[PDB]
Design an enzyme around this catalytic site. Structure first.
Site, mmCIF file in Angstrom:
data_model
loop_
_atom_site.group_PDB
_atom_site.id
_atom_site.type_symbol
_atom_site.label_atom_id
_atom_site.label_comp_id
_atom_site.label_asym_id
_atom_site.label_seq_id
_atom_site.Cartn_x
_atom_site.Cartn_y
_atom_site.Cartn_z
ATOM 1 N N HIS A 195 -4.783 -10.603 7.598
ATOM 2 C CA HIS A 195 -5.654 -9.544 8.128
ATOM 3 C C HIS A 195 -5.939 -8.438 7.103
ATOM 4 O O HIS A 195 -6.738 -7.529 7.364
ATOM 5 C CB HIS A 195 -5.138 -8.972 9.460
ATOM 6 N N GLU A 205 3.739 0.867 -8.861
ATOM 7 C CA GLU A 205 3.412 2.126 -8.197
ATOM 8 C C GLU A 205 4.617 2.756 -7.515
ATOM 9 O O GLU A 205 5.452 2.051 -6.938
ATOM 10 C CB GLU A 205 2.343 1.880 -7.131
ATOM 11 N N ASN A 241 4.268 6.884 -6.562
ATOM 12 C CA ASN A 241 3.318 7.813 -5.954
ATOM 13 C C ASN A 241 1.919 7.259 -6.117
ATOM 14 O O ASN A 241 1.369 7.313 -7.208
ATOM 15 C CB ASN A 241 3.407 9.184 -6.626
ATOM 16 N N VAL A 285 -0.827 9.630 -7.813
ATOM 17 C CA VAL A 285 -0.594 10.273 -9.103
ATOM 18 C C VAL A 285 -0.263 9.234 -10.168
ATOM 19 O O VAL A 285 0.639 8.432 -9.984
ATOM 20 C CB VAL A 285 0.589 11.262 -9.030
ATOM 21 N N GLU A 321 2.209 1.967 -13.893
ATOM 22 C CA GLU A 321 1.293 1.177 -13.087
ATOM 23 C C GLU A 321 0.580 0.091 -13.888
ATOM 24 O O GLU A 321 0.303 0.252 -15.072
ATOM 25 C CB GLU A 321 0.234 2.076 -12.448
ATOM 26 N N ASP A 378 -0.549 -15.366 9.876
ATOM 27 C CA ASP A 378 -1.017 -14.148 9.225
ATOM 28 C C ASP A 378 -0.459 -14.063 7.812
ATOM 29 O O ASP A 378 0.428 -13.260 7.518
ATOM 30 C CB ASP A 378 -0.609 -12.919 10.060
ATOM 31 N N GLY A 436 -0.542 0.758 7.626
ATOM 32 C CA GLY A 436 -0.510 0.986 6.193
ATOM 33 C C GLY A 436 0.578 0.166 5.527
ATOM 34 O O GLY A 436 0.546 -0.055 4.316
ATOM 35 N N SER A 469 1.163 -3.023 6.548
ATOM 36 C CA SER A 469 0.760 -4.432 6.693
ATOM 37 C C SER A 469 0.710 -5.161 5.370
ATOM 38 O O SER A 469 0.254 -4.611 4.373
ATOM 39 C CB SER A 469 -0.621 -4.557 7.336
ATOM 40 N N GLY A 470 1.159 -6.410 5.379
ATOM 41 C CA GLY A 470 1.084 -7.253 4.201
ATOM 42 C C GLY A 470 2.277 -7.110 3.276
ATOM 43 O O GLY A 470 2.486 -7.959 2.402
#
Ligand code: CA
Lengths: 223, 34
Positions: free
Chosen positions: A40, A52, A54, A57, A62, A84, A175, A177-178
């Site tokens: 989804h 990551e 933050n 910022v 990253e 899913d 937020g 999810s996954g």
């Protein structure tokens, strides 16, 4: 993550953020080229962000890598959320280091009671506006099939399990999810759905990764 | 999530109305699905 704790920068090195102009889902790095997420969470033009902490910022560890392929499970149902799971291929390989690392797939399914680590940048309140800058973490146990099925009558398929606390208070939320559910160093779950977040008798529901090891390997081998 | 006990995926998604949201999620007052 509701009722959790601040992980600490890069302490969950397999956690990635899926970004389409804003963070919308998590994912788990399983090798230098592939990320496991929820079906989804499919969008065209996803950017995977690794290393990551933050998300708002630039902190210097990253790696931003565009998805070249985003492959939803062929039997995914968007109403029931059965199957899913989605595989994302990175356009270029991530550079593996202490802060960007893969997590192992399971060789079999985890039993009820096993403790796991759930993580993400999802809402840190069950409702309202509380979307974090830094990665949050929760320790939570896998719940019994009978508890799960009684909590969600008729809604739990063979490809789903519940983890968390029947008393409520601690859960994944919008937020997250996954993202990963990791138990004994194996990726056993993917944050999928729930009725609310952190409510009594309504634990989080997760995609059962152990059911898809063959499919993951076959998809990676042919793409 | 709404109050109906439906399947609401835990994706972060901006919305204006319920149809912008996946599954049984509704669009909450803050303009995010839940
Ligand atoms: Ca950052």
């Amino acid at each position: 993550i509701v009722g959790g704790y601040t992980c600490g920068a890069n302490t969950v090195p397999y956690q990635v953020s899926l970004n389409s102009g804003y963070h919308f889902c998590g994912g788990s790095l399983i090798n230098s080229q592939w990320v496991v997420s929820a079906a989804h969470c499919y969008k065209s033009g996803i950017q995977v962000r690794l290393g990551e902490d933050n998300i708002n910022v630039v902190e210097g560890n990253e790696q931003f890598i565009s998805a070249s392929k985003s492959i939803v499970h062929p039997s995914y149902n968007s109403n029931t959320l059965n199957n899913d799971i989605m595989l994302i291929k990175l356009k270029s390989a991530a550079s593996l280091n202490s802060r960007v690392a893969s997590i192992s797939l399971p060789t079999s399914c985890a039993s009820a009671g096993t403790q796991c680590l759930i993580s993400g940048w999802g809402n840190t309140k069950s409702s309202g506006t509380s979307y974090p800058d830094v990665l949050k973490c929760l320790k939570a146990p896998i719940l019994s099939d009978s508890s799960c099925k009684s909590a969600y009558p008729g809604q739990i398929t063979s490809n789903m399990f519940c983890a968390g606390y029947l008393e409520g208070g601690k859960d994944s939320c919008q937020g997250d999810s996954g993202g990963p559910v990791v138990c004994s160093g194996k990726l056993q779950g993917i944050v999928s759905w729930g009725s609310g977040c952190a409510q009594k008798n309504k634990p989080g529901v997760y995609t059962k990764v152990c059911n898809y090891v063959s499919w993951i390997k076959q998809t990676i081998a042919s793409n | 999530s709404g109050s109906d006990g439906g399947v609401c995926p835990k994706i972060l998604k901006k919305c204006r109305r319920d149809s912008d949201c996946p599954g049984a999620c509704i669009c909450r007052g803050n303009g995010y699905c839940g």
